[PDB]
């Protein structure tokens, strides 16, 4: 099921898969793989990232080959997260919807809801999303910066 | 009485579940206890802060 990808995908999807792929034979692990999924111009949720390994890695042994990597990226094209959709979702941690999220409410929802981050990763998200300052999460410019893959 | 009724209206903005004008954060016992304490203390001492914070 390495066919749902396009050649434009498959090329860089090797090139970044190759960044942990040994001697050109087409094989890496799954954590290096989750690292690889993320910089392919794509944005895999870890839930889909693991449900994908479930079907490609039939036994979940943790080793994935390159036709198997084309297999994973095949379904990643189906659940590709888009531009306006995350702009909309950021308005939800903002409970009153004032336009941006507060200081550590972001630190509390992303560390206990969804595919949870960490306080250090929340500070990293503050440097990336909270461009307004320390505690006013600007998701419009955040979408602008990540859509610039 | 003006601030009494203002805060009474504000209370239902936090004691009843009705978004976006309210949200169910508290419990009924906490509402009653806070109302009891504030009505007992602050408005009895209203003239105190009136003499200090009002020109």
């Amino acid at each position: 099921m390495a066919d749902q990808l396009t050649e434009e995908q498959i090329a860089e999807f090797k090139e970044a898969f190759s960044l942990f792929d040994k001697d050109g034979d087409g094989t890496i692990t799954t954590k290096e793989l989750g690292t690889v999924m993320r910089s392919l111009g794509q944005n895999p949720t870890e839930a889909e990232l693991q449900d994908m390994i479930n079907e490609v890695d039939a036994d979940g042994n943790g080793t994935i080959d390159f036709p198997e990597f084309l297999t994973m990226m095949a379904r990643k094209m189906k659940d590709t997260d888009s531009e306006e959709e995350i702009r909309e979702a950021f308005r939800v941690f903002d409970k009153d919807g004032n336009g941006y999220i507060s200081a550590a409410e972001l630190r509390h929802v992303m560390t206990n809801l969804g595919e949870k981050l960490t306080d250090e990763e929340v500070d990293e998200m503050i440097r990336e999303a909270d461009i307004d300052g320390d505690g006013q999460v600007n998701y419009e410019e955040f979408v602008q910066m990540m859509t610039a893959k | 009485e003006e601030c009494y009724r203002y805060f009474t209206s504000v209370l239902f903005c936090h004691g009843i579940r009705r978004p976006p004008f309210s949200i169910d954060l508290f419990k009924e016992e906490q509402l009653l206890a806070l109302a009891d304490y504030v009505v007992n203390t602050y408005f009895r001492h209203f003239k105190l802060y009136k003499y200090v914070f009002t020109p």
């Binding site: 939800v92 941690f93 969804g114 595919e115 | -």
Partner: peptide, 15 residues
């Protein structure tokens, strides 16, 4: 709370 509790979880999963 169906919007700012559980859709927060979905929003985080995606964001």
């Amino acid at each position: 709370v169906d919007s700012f509790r559980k859709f927060e979880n979905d929003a985080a999963v995606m964001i």
